């Protein structure tokens, strides 16, 4: 019912730019902490970013700091990730996750293979 479906993706050259947008339409978007998650083609799921309830507390996973920018629009019920200066190691299947409970500053089970509040795949390839 949460209905998280992203956009963007495709194939880009090394050092290029991409713009991924997350669309949520099944819940109060402004009461939840929305965080991006990526999965390498062979490796496991990896947390990459997050954003607070209002859009104040922002963190990154390292090796993406200063290259990936996350933003949200409460009115438009959309979540963004402006990713710049890509590398061939950055190719993955990005998932737009969501912390399970509202009005909480923590959320477990976001980087798990059986989580229920994350979107489908958005393939991003760098060659």
């Amino acid at each position: 019912q949460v209905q998280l479906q992203e956009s963007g993706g495709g194939l880009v050259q090394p050092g290029g730019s991409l713009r991924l947008s997350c669309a949520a339409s099944g819940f109060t978007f402004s009461n939840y902490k929305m965080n991006w998650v990526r999965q390498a083609p062979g490796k496991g799921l990896e947390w990459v970013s997050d954003i607070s309830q209002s859009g104040a507390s922002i963190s990154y996973t390292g090796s993406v700091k200063g290259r990936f920018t996350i933003s949200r629009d409460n009115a438009k019920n959309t979540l963004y990730l402006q990713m710049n200066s890509l590398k061939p190691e950055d190719t993955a299947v990005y998932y737009c996750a969501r912390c399970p409970a509202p009005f909480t500053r923590d959320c477990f089970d976001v980087t798990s293979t059986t989580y229920a509040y994350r979107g489908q795949g958005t393939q991003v390839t760098v060659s």
Binding site: Q1, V2, G26, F27, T28, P100, A101, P102, A116, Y117
Partner: peptide, 26 residues
């Protein structure tokens, strides 16, 4: 369950009948 949905099971037959996805959390 925690997928923000509830099912309805008939014990003897043993298959789900309806799903109610009203909620938005656990």
């Amino acid at each position: 369950a925690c997928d923000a949905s509830a099912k309805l099971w008939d014990v003897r037959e043993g298959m789900c009948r309806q799903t109610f996805t009203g909620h938005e959390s656990d």
